[PDB]
Amino acid sequence: QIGAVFDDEGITKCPRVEDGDTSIFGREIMAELIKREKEAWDEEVEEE
Amino acid sequence: EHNLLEYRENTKAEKKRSREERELLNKAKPFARMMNRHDFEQFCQGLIDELNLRQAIAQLQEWRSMRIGDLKSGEKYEQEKALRIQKSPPSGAALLVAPELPARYKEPIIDANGFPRPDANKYVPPPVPGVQPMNLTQDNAPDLHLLTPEEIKLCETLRIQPKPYIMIKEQILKEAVKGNGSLKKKQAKEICRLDSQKGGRIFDFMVNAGWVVKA
Amino acid sequence: LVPPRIDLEPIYTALKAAIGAEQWPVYKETLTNFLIGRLNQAELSERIDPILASQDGQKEHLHNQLIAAIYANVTREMPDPGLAPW
Protein backbone atom coordinates (compact mmCIF):
# COMPACT_ATOMS: atom_id res chain seq x y z
CA GLN A 1 0.00 0.00 0.00
CA ILE A 2 2.47 2.66 1.15
CA GLY A 3 5.23 1.66 -1.26
CA ALA A 4 3.06 2.47 -4.28
CA VAL A 5 3.65 6.18 -3.64
CA PHE A 6 7.43 5.87 -4.05
CA ASP A 7 7.08 3.92 -7.32
CA ASP A 8 8.95 6.56 -9.34
CA GLU A 9 12.30 5.11 -10.40
CA GLY A 10 14.36 8.22 -9.63
CA ILE A 11 13.97 8.00 -5.85
CA THR A 12 17.04 5.74 -5.51
CA LYS A 13 19.17 6.18 -8.67
CA CYS A 14 21.96 8.63 -9.45
CA PRO A 15 21.70 9.94 -13.04
CA ARG A 16 24.75 9.05 -15.12
CA VAL A 17 26.69 11.27 -17.51
CA GLU A 18 26.88 8.54 -20.17
CA ASP A 19 23.10 8.46 -20.58
CA GLY A 20 23.15 11.88 -22.26
CA ASP A 21 21.37 15.13 -21.37
CA THR A 22 20.50 13.85 -17.90
CA SER A 23 21.51 17.09 -16.15
CA ILE A 24 18.95 18.21 -13.57
CA PHE A 25 19.72 21.82 -14.58
CA GLY A 26 17.96 21.96 -17.93
CA ARG A 27 17.60 25.48 -19.28
CA GLU A 28 13.88 24.97 -19.92
CA ILE A 29 13.35 24.86 -16.14
CA MET A 30 16.23 27.10 -15.04
CA ALA A 31 14.61 29.94 -17.00
CA GLU A 32 11.58 29.92 -14.70
CA LEU A 33 13.58 29.45 -11.49
CA ILE A 34 15.77 32.47 -12.28
CA LYS A 35 12.70 34.60 -12.98
CA ARG A 36 11.09 33.61 -9.68
CA GLU A 37 14.33 34.23 -7.79
CA LYS A 38 14.55 37.67 -9.39
CA GLU A 39 10.95 38.31 -8.32
CA ALA A 40 11.70 37.43 -4.69
CA TRP A 41 14.78 39.68 -4.70
CA ASP A 42 12.71 42.65 -5.85
CA GLU A 43 10.09 41.98 -3.17
CA GLU A 44 12.80 41.83 -0.50
CA VAL A 45 14.34 45.10 -1.71
CA GLU A 46 10.95 46.82 -1.60
CA GLU A 47 10.40 45.50 1.92
CA GLU A 48 14.00 46.38 2.83
CA GLU B 1 31.14 8.22 -10.72
CA HIS B 2 32.76 11.35 -9.23
CA ASN B 3 36.09 9.44 -9.16
CA LEU B 4 36.15 8.87 -5.40
CA LEU B 5 38.79 6.14 -5.81
CA GLU B 6 41.56 8.73 -6.37
CA TYR B 7 42.67 9.40 -2.81
CA ARG B 8 45.86 11.19 -3.85
CA GLU B 9 44.24 13.48 -6.43
CA ASN B 10 41.13 14.42 -4.46
CA THR B 11 43.09 15.21 -1.29
CA LYS B 12 45.82 17.33 -2.89
CA ALA B 13 43.31 19.82 -4.32
CA GLU B 14 41.61 20.00 -0.93
CA LYS B 15 45.00 20.82 0.60
CA LYS B 16 45.70 23.43 -2.09
CA ARG B 17 42.39 25.21 -1.52
CA SER B 18 42.09 27.79 1.25
CA ARG B 19 40.17 27.62 4.54
CA GLU B 20 36.92 29.35 3.55
CA GLU B 21 36.59 27.40 0.30
CA ARG B 22 37.28 24.14 2.13
CA GLU B 23 34.39 24.72 4.55
CA LEU B 24 31.97 25.56 1.74
CA LEU B 25 32.83 22.46 -0.30
CA ASN B 26 32.59 20.26 2.80
CA LYS B 27 29.12 21.71 3.44
CA ALA B 28 27.78 20.84 -0.03
CA LYS B 29 29.28 17.34 -0.24
CA PRO B 30 26.17 15.21 0.50
CA PHE B 31 24.16 16.36 -2.53
CA ALA B 32 26.48 14.54 -4.96
CA ARG B 33 24.20 11.49 -4.73
CA MET B 34 21.62 13.22 -6.96
CA MET B 35 23.69 15.03 -9.62
CA ASN B 36 25.99 13.64 -12.30
CA ARG B 37 29.70 14.50 -12.48
CA HIS B 38 29.46 17.71 -14.51
CA ASP B 39 26.56 19.13 -12.51
CA PHE B 40 28.45 18.68 -9.25
CA GLU B 41 31.48 20.44 -10.76
CA GLN B 42 29.29 23.32 -11.94
CA PHE B 43 27.50 23.48 -8.59
CA CYS B 44 30.72 23.76 -6.56
CA GLN B 45 32.46 26.15 -8.96
CA GLY B 46 29.55 28.59 -8.75
CA LEU B 47 29.82 28.82 -4.96
CA ILE B 48 33.55 29.52 -5.27
CA ASP B 49 32.90 32.18 -7.92
CA GLU B 50 30.44 34.07 -5.71
CA LEU B 51 32.70 33.94 -2.66
CA ASN B 52 35.71 35.30 -4.55
CA LEU B 53 33.66 38.08 -6.16
CA ARG B 54 32.47 39.29 -2.76
CA GLN B 55 36.06 39.43 -1.50
CA ALA B 56 37.24 41.43 -4.52
CA ILE B 57 34.38 43.93 -4.28
CA ALA B 58 34.99 44.41 -0.55
CA GLN B 59 38.71 44.80 -1.26
CA LEU B 60 38.17 47.49 -3.90
CA GLN B 61 35.74 49.52 -1.79
CA GLU B 62 38.40 49.74 0.92
CA TRP B 63 40.94 51.15 -1.55
CA ARG B 64 38.67 53.93 -2.82
CA SER B 65 38.31 55.31 0.72
CA MET B 66 42.11 55.66 0.98
CA ARG B 67 42.27 57.84 -2.17
CA ILE B 68 44.06 55.17 -4.23
CA GLY B 69 43.39 55.91 -7.88
CA ASP B 70 44.90 53.09 -9.93
CA LEU B 71 45.12 49.32 -9.80
CA LYS B 72 48.93 49.47 -9.83
CA SER B 73 49.15 51.67 -6.73
CA GLY B 74 46.58 49.52 -4.94
CA GLU B 75 48.87 46.49 -5.05
CA LYS B 76 51.80 48.66 -3.94
CA TYR B 77 49.80 49.82 -0.92
CA GLU B 78 48.86 46.26 0.05
CA GLN B 79 52.51 45.19 -0.03
CA GLU B 80 53.52 48.12 2.20
CA LYS B 81 50.60 47.45 4.55
CA ALA B 82 51.75 43.85 4.90
CA LEU B 83 55.21 45.17 5.79
CA ARG B 84 53.69 47.63 8.27
CA ILE B 85 51.57 45.04 10.08
CA GLN B 86 54.74 42.95 10.14
CA LYS B 87 56.46 46.12 11.35
CA SER B 88 53.91 46.42 14.17
CA PRO B 89 50.26 31.32 -6.39
CA PRO B 90 47.79 34.23 -6.41
CA SER B 91 44.31 33.52 -5.08
CA GLY B 92 41.00 34.09 -6.83
CA ALA B 93 40.47 37.37 -4.99
CA ALA B 94 43.88 38.50 -6.28
CA LEU B 95 43.31 37.62 -9.95
CA LEU B 96 40.10 39.64 -10.26
CA VAL B 97 41.81 42.82 -9.03
CA ALA B 98 44.70 42.49 -11.50
CA PRO B 99 45.35 45.19 -14.11
CA GLU B 100 44.01 42.83 -16.80
CA LEU B 101 40.71 41.06 -16.16
CA PRO B 102 40.34 37.33 -16.95
CA ALA B 103 38.74 36.51 -20.29
CA ARG B 104 35.79 34.66 -18.72
CA TYR B 105 34.67 37.87 -16.90
CA LYS B 106 34.03 39.94 -20.06
CA GLU B 107 30.52 38.69 -20.88
CA PRO B 108 27.18 38.15 -19.10
CA ILE B 109 26.80 34.76 -17.45
CA ILE B 110 23.08 34.74 -18.30
CA ASP B 111 22.13 36.59 -21.47
CA ALA B 112 19.37 39.17 -21.88
CA ASN B 113 16.57 36.67 -22.52
CA GLY B 114 17.20 35.09 -19.08
CA PHE B 115 18.75 31.83 -20.30
CA PRO B 116 22.05 30.99 -18.54
CA ARG B 117 25.00 30.56 -20.87
CA PRO B 118 25.80 26.91 -21.67
CA ASP B 119 29.31 27.22 -20.19
CA ALA B 120 28.25 28.68 -16.86
CA ASN B 121 31.24 27.32 -14.94
CA LYS B 122 43.51 54.20 -38.42
CA TYR B 123 45.12 57.43 -39.59
CA VAL B 124 48.78 57.24 -38.55
CA PRO B 125 50.46 60.68 -38.76
CA PRO B 126 54.06 60.51 -39.96
CA PRO B 127 56.70 61.04 -37.26
CA VAL B 128 57.53 64.73 -37.63
CA PRO B 129 61.30 65.28 -38.06
CA GLY B 130 63.12 65.94 -34.80
CA VAL B 131 60.25 64.75 -32.58
CA GLN B 132 60.91 62.31 -29.72
CA PRO B 133 57.68 60.76 -28.39
CA MET B 134 57.27 60.88 -24.61
CA ASN B 135 55.40 58.21 -22.68
CA LEU B 136 52.16 59.35 -21.02
CA THR B 137 51.61 58.11 -17.46
CA GLN B 138 48.52 58.36 -15.27
CA ASP B 139 50.55 60.26 -12.66
CA ASN B 140 51.75 62.78 -15.28
CA ALA B 141 48.65 63.13 -17.48
CA PRO B 142 45.68 64.20 -15.29
CA ASP B 143 42.89 63.80 -17.86
CA LEU B 144 44.36 60.86 -19.78
CA HIS B 145 41.30 58.69 -19.09
CA LEU B 146 39.15 60.73 -21.56
CA LEU B 147 41.24 60.90 -24.75
CA THR B 148 40.15 58.44 -27.41
CA PRO B 149 42.61 55.74 -28.55
CA GLU B 150 42.84 57.30 -32.02
CA GLU B 151 43.91 60.62 -30.44
CA ILE B 152 46.27 59.41 -27.70
CA LYS B 153 48.76 58.20 -30.31
CA LEU B 154 48.83 61.70 -31.81
CA CYS B 155 49.64 63.29 -28.44
CA GLU B 156 52.65 61.04 -27.88
CA THR B 157 53.84 61.43 -31.47
CA LEU B 158 53.56 65.22 -31.10
CA ARG B 159 54.88 65.75 -27.53
CA ILE B 160 51.85 67.55 -26.11
CA GLN B 161 49.99 67.02 -22.85
CA PRO B 162 46.24 66.23 -22.80
CA LYS B 163 44.89 69.42 -21.24
CA PRO B 164 46.74 71.70 -23.70
CA TYR B 165 45.50 69.46 -26.52
CA ILE B 166 41.85 69.91 -25.53
CA MET B 167 42.27 73.69 -25.45
CA ILE B 168 43.73 73.63 -28.97
CA LYS B 169 40.81 71.45 -30.09
CA GLU B 170 38.30 73.96 -28.71
CA GLN B 171 39.74 77.07 -30.37
CA ILE B 172 40.00 75.42 -33.79
CA LEU B 173 36.41 74.22 -33.47
CA LYS B 174 35.21 77.71 -32.51
CA GLU B 175 37.04 79.37 -35.40
CA ALA B 176 35.65 76.90 -37.95
CA VAL B 177 32.01 77.01 -36.85
CA LYS B 178 31.92 80.81 -37.01
CA GLY B 179 32.70 80.57 -40.73
CA ASN B 180 30.55 77.64 -41.90
CA GLY B 181 33.38 75.28 -40.91
CA SER B 182 35.85 76.10 -43.69
CA LEU B 183 39.31 77.50 -42.95
CA LYS B 184 42.56 77.94 -44.86
CA LYS B 185 45.72 76.01 -44.05
CA LYS B 186 47.48 79.14 -42.80
CA GLN B 187 44.36 79.78 -40.72
CA ALA B 188 44.93 76.55 -38.79
CA LYS B 189 48.67 77.20 -38.50
CA GLU B 190 48.28 80.61 -36.86
CA ILE B 191 45.56 79.43 -34.47
CA CYS B 192 47.70 76.62 -33.06
CA ARG B 193 50.57 79.04 -32.27
CA LEU B 194 53.34 76.42 -32.36
CA ASP B 195 55.78 74.96 -34.88
CA SER B 196 54.54 74.65 -38.45
CA GLN B 197 54.67 70.85 -38.55
CA LYS B 198 52.76 70.49 -35.28
CA GLY B 199 49.94 72.74 -36.46
CA GLY B 200 49.92 71.03 -39.84
CA ARG B 201 49.68 67.53 -38.36
CA ILE B 202 46.85 68.29 -35.92
CA PHE B 203 44.89 70.05 -38.67
CA ASP B 204 45.39 67.09 -41.01
CA PHE B 205 44.03 64.81 -38.29
CA MET B 206 40.90 66.92 -37.72
CA VAL B 207 39.98 67.12 -41.41
CA ASN B 208 40.42 63.36 -41.77
CA ALA B 209 38.26 62.85 -38.68
CA GLY B 210 35.61 65.11 -40.23
CA TRP B 211 35.19 67.83 -37.59
CA VAL B 212 36.39 70.52 -40.04
CA VAL B 213 36.79 71.06 -43.79
CA LYS B 214 39.78 72.57 -45.59
CA ALA B 215 38.86 75.61 -47.68
CA LEU C 1 23.95 92.76 -30.48
CA VAL C 2 23.97 89.09 -29.51
CA PRO C 3 22.99 87.09 -32.64
CA PRO C 4 19.98 84.75 -32.66
CA ARG C 5 20.11 81.15 -31.52
CA ILE C 6 20.35 78.21 -33.92
CA ASP C 7 17.38 76.02 -34.77
CA LEU C 8 17.96 72.59 -33.25
CA GLU C 9 14.69 70.74 -33.95
CA PRO C 10 15.85 69.12 -37.24
CA ILE C 11 19.26 68.17 -35.85
CA TYR C 12 17.78 66.22 -32.93
CA THR C 13 14.79 64.76 -34.77
CA ALA C 14 17.05 63.10 -37.34
CA LEU C 15 19.10 61.61 -34.51
CA LYS C 16 16.02 60.09 -32.87
CA ALA C 17 14.91 58.60 -36.20
CA ALA C 18 18.41 57.42 -37.15
CA ILE C 19 19.24 55.52 -33.95
CA GLY C 20 15.77 54.01 -33.63
CA ALA C 21 13.64 54.20 -30.49
CA GLU C 22 14.55 50.55 -29.79
CA GLN C 23 18.19 51.14 -28.80
CA TRP C 24 17.68 54.86 -28.13
CA PRO C 25 17.12 54.51 -24.34
CA VAL C 26 20.57 52.94 -23.97
CA TYR C 27 22.26 55.63 -26.06
CA LYS C 28 20.68 58.44 -24.05
CA GLU C 29 21.49 56.77 -20.72
CA THR C 30 25.17 56.31 -21.57
CA LEU C 31 25.67 59.82 -22.97
CA THR C 32 24.00 61.56 -20.02
CA ASN C 33 26.02 59.55 -17.50
CA PHE C 34 29.29 60.42 -19.26
CA LEU C 35 28.43 64.13 -19.19
CA ILE C 36 27.68 63.93 -15.46
CA GLY C 37 31.14 62.41 -15.02
CA ARG C 38 30.48 58.76 -14.16
CA LEU C 39 32.28 56.98 -17.02
CA ASN C 40 35.59 56.91 -18.87
CA GLN C 41 36.21 57.03 -22.60
CA ALA C 42 36.79 53.27 -22.60
CA GLU C 43 33.36 52.48 -21.15
CA LEU C 44 31.55 55.07 -23.28
CA SER C 45 33.04 53.82 -26.56
CA GLU C 46 32.38 50.18 -25.64
CA ARG C 47 28.69 50.94 -25.01
CA ILE C 48 27.92 53.32 -27.88
CA ASP C 49 30.11 52.20 -30.80
CA PRO C 50 27.69 49.38 -31.76
CA ILE C 51 24.78 51.83 -31.76
CA LEU C 52 26.49 54.38 -34.02
CA ALA C 53 27.94 51.80 -36.41
CA SER C 54 26.89 52.22 -40.04
CA GLN C 55 28.15 51.70 -43.58
CA ASP C 56 26.65 54.88 -45.05
CA GLY C 57 28.08 56.72 -42.04
CA GLN C 58 25.00 58.85 -41.36
CA LYS C 59 24.88 58.03 -37.62
CA GLU C 60 28.33 59.17 -36.49
CA HIS C 61 27.82 62.32 -38.56
CA LEU C 62 24.58 63.22 -36.79
CA HIS C 63 26.19 62.56 -33.40
CA ASN C 64 28.96 65.03 -34.24
CA GLN C 65 26.49 67.45 -35.83
CA LEU C 66 24.36 67.59 -32.68
CA ILE C 67 27.42 68.12 -30.47
CA ALA C 68 28.61 70.94 -32.72
CA ALA C 69 25.18 72.57 -32.52
CA ILE C 70 25.25 72.48 -28.71
CA TYR C 71 28.64 74.22 -28.66
CA ALA C 72 27.86 76.83 -31.32
CA ASN C 73 24.81 78.17 -29.46
CA VAL C 74 27.07 79.13 -26.52
CA THR C 75 27.41 82.54 -28.22
CA ARG C 76 23.72 83.21 -28.93
CA GLU C 77 20.51 83.96 -27.04
CA MET C 78 19.30 82.15 -23.95
CA PRO C 79 16.18 80.18 -24.98
CA ASP C 80 12.84 79.96 -23.21
CA PRO C 81 13.35 78.14 -19.88
CA GLY C 82 12.05 74.61 -19.53
CA LEU C 83 11.98 71.39 -21.53
CA ALA C 84 11.47 71.98 -25.23
CA PRO C 85 7.86 71.34 -26.33
CA TRP C 86 8.95 69.47 -29.47
Added chain:
Amino acid sequence: RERGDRVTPFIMPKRGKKHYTEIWAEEDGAMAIDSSPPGGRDRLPPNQARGSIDNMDDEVAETDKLSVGPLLTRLLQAMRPENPATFMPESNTEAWKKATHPKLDYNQVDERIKQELRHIGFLPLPPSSAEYDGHYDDEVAARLRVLQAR
Protein backbone atom coordinates in the same frame (compact mmCIF):
# COMPACT_ATOMS: atom_id res chain seq x y z
CA ARG D 1 17.22 28.25 1.35
CA GLU D 2 19.90 30.83 2.27
CA ARG D 3 20.95 33.58 -0.14
CA GLY D 4 23.30 35.78 1.89
CA ASP D 5 23.89 39.52 1.93
CA ARG D 6 22.59 41.62 -0.97
CA VAL D 7 22.99 45.28 0.05
CA THR D 8 26.59 46.06 1.00
CA PRO D 9 28.33 44.77 -2.18
CA PHE D 10 26.28 47.13 -4.39
CA ILE D 11 27.49 50.42 -2.86
CA MET D 12 29.74 52.91 -4.67
CA PRO D 13 31.86 55.00 -2.27
CA LYS D 14 33.44 58.28 -3.32
CA ARG D 15 37.12 59.22 -3.33
CA GLY D 16 38.35 59.61 0.23
CA LYS D 17 39.79 62.76 1.73
CA LYS D 18 42.91 61.66 3.62
CA HIS D 19 45.62 59.88 1.65
CA TYR D 20 46.68 56.52 3.06
CA THR D 21 50.11 57.85 4.03
CA GLU D 22 48.62 60.54 6.27
CA ILE D 23 46.29 58.23 8.20
CA TRP D 24 49.21 55.83 8.64
CA ALA D 25 51.06 58.85 10.05
CA GLU D 26 48.30 59.29 12.66
CA GLU D 27 50.17 57.02 15.08
CA ASP D 28 53.42 58.96 15.64
CA GLY D 29 55.18 62.11 14.45
CA ALA D 30 55.32 61.25 10.75
CA MET D 31 53.49 64.30 9.34
CA ALA D 32 56.57 66.54 9.51
CA ILE D 33 56.98 65.99 5.74
CA ASP D 34 54.29 67.49 3.50
CA SER D 35 54.25 66.05 -0.03
CA SER D 36 51.32 68.04 -1.42
CA PRO D 37 51.70 67.96 -5.23
CA PRO D 38 52.73 71.36 -6.63
CA GLY D 39 50.14 71.17 -9.42
CA GLY D 40 47.72 69.21 -7.24
CA ARG D 41 46.96 72.04 -4.83
CA ASP D 42 43.65 71.72 -2.96
CA ARG D 43 43.68 67.97 -3.78
CA LEU D 44 41.93 68.69 -7.12
CA PRO D 45 44.59 69.22 -9.81
CA PRO D 46 41.79 68.75 -12.35
CA ASN D 47 38.34 70.38 -12.38
CA GLN D 48 39.78 73.92 -12.16
CA ALA D 49 39.87 75.86 -15.42
CA ARG D 50 43.01 77.99 -15.45
CA GLY D 51 44.80 80.19 -17.96
CA SER D 52 43.67 81.13 -21.46
CA ILE D 53 44.99 80.65 -24.99
CA ASP D 54 46.98 83.87 -24.49
CA ASN D 55 49.50 82.00 -22.31
CA MET D 56 49.93 79.10 -24.75
CA ASP D 57 53.57 78.40 -25.60
CA ASP D 58 55.70 75.49 -26.74
CA GLU D 59 57.52 75.37 -23.40
CA VAL D 60 54.27 75.37 -21.41
CA ALA D 61 52.60 72.85 -23.73
CA GLU D 62 54.60 70.17 -21.88
CA THR D 63 53.07 71.33 -18.57
CA ASP D 64 49.39 71.17 -17.59
CA LYS D 65 49.17 74.81 -16.52
CA LEU D 66 46.10 75.48 -18.70
CA SER D 67 42.67 73.83 -18.68
CA VAL D 68 39.13 74.32 -20.00
CA GLY D 69 36.94 73.28 -17.06
CA PRO D 70 35.30 69.93 -16.31
CA LEU D 71 31.96 70.16 -18.11
CA LEU D 72 33.36 71.54 -21.37
CA THR D 73 36.07 68.86 -21.41
CA ARG D 74 33.50 66.06 -21.17
CA LEU D 75 31.32 67.57 -23.90
CA LEU D 76 34.13 67.93 -26.44
CA GLN D 77 35.43 64.40 -25.85
CA ALA D 78 31.88 63.09 -26.27
CA MET D 79 32.44 63.54 -30.00
CA ARG D 80 33.64 60.47 -31.88
CA PRO D 81 36.22 60.49 -34.71
CA GLU D 82 35.02 58.95 -37.98
CA ASN D 83 36.87 58.53 -41.28
CA PRO D 84 31.68 68.23 -42.71
CA ALA D 85 30.53 67.95 -39.09
CA THR D 86 30.59 71.75 -38.55
CA PHE D 87 28.04 72.75 -41.20
CA MET D 88 25.37 74.91 -39.63
CA PRO D 89 22.01 75.22 -41.43
CA GLU D 90 21.61 78.99 -41.90
CA SER D 91 25.21 80.10 -41.28
CA ASN D 92 26.06 80.16 -45.00
CA THR D 93 24.13 83.43 -45.40
CA GLU D 94 26.28 86.56 -45.32
CA ALA D 95 23.81 87.97 -42.78
CA TRP D 96 25.28 85.44 -40.34
CA LYS D 97 28.80 86.50 -41.32
CA LYS D 98 28.17 90.06 -40.11
CA ALA D 99 27.11 88.71 -36.71
CA THR D 100 29.17 89.65 -33.65
CA HIS D 101 29.68 87.72 -30.42
CA PRO D 102 30.37 88.42 -26.73
CA LYS D 103 33.43 87.26 -24.76
CA LEU D 104 32.39 84.83 -22.02
CA ASP D 105 34.62 82.87 -19.62
CA TYR D 106 34.98 79.23 -18.66
CA ASN D 107 33.02 79.58 -15.41
CA GLN D 108 30.20 80.96 -17.60
CA VAL D 109 30.45 78.60 -20.59
CA ASP D 110 29.95 75.55 -18.38
CA GLU D 111 26.75 77.08 -17.02
CA ARG D 112 25.55 77.84 -20.55
CA ILE D 113 26.19 74.27 -21.70
CA LYS D 114 24.48 72.96 -18.56
CA GLN D 115 21.33 74.95 -19.38
CA GLU D 116 21.45 74.01 -23.06
CA LEU D 117 21.51 70.27 -22.39
CA ARG D 118 18.67 70.97 -19.97
CA HIS D 119 16.59 72.33 -22.85
CA ILE D 120 17.24 69.25 -24.99
CA GLY D 121 16.63 66.78 -22.15
CA PHE D 122 20.02 65.07 -21.70
CA LEU D 123 20.20 66.47 -18.15
CA PRO D 124 17.64 66.38 -15.32
CA LEU D 125 15.28 69.31 -15.01
CA PRO D 126 15.99 71.59 -12.03
CA PRO D 127 14.30 70.85 -8.69
CA SER D 128 10.77 72.21 -8.46
CA SER D 129 10.43 75.45 -6.49
CA ALA D 130 27.68 67.45 -10.78
CA GLU D 131 30.04 65.41 -8.57
CA TYR D 132 33.24 65.96 -10.55
CA ASP D 133 35.20 66.18 -7.28
CA GLY D 134 34.30 62.57 -6.44
CA HIS D 135 36.40 61.01 -9.21
CA TYR D 136 33.61 58.61 -10.12
CA ASP D 137 35.25 57.63 -13.43
CA ASP D 138 38.53 56.67 -11.73
CA GLU D 139 40.24 53.58 -13.11
CA VAL D 140 39.43 51.72 -9.88
CA ALA D 141 35.73 52.56 -10.12
CA ALA D 142 35.45 51.03 -13.59
CA ARG D 143 36.73 47.70 -12.27
CA LEU D 144 34.28 47.86 -9.36
CA ARG D 145 31.32 48.32 -11.72
CA VAL D 146 32.45 45.31 -13.76
CA LEU D 147 32.55 42.95 -10.77
CA GLN D 148 29.24 44.21 -9.36
CA ALA D 149 27.51 43.30 -12.62
CA ARG D 150 28.88 39.76 -12.39
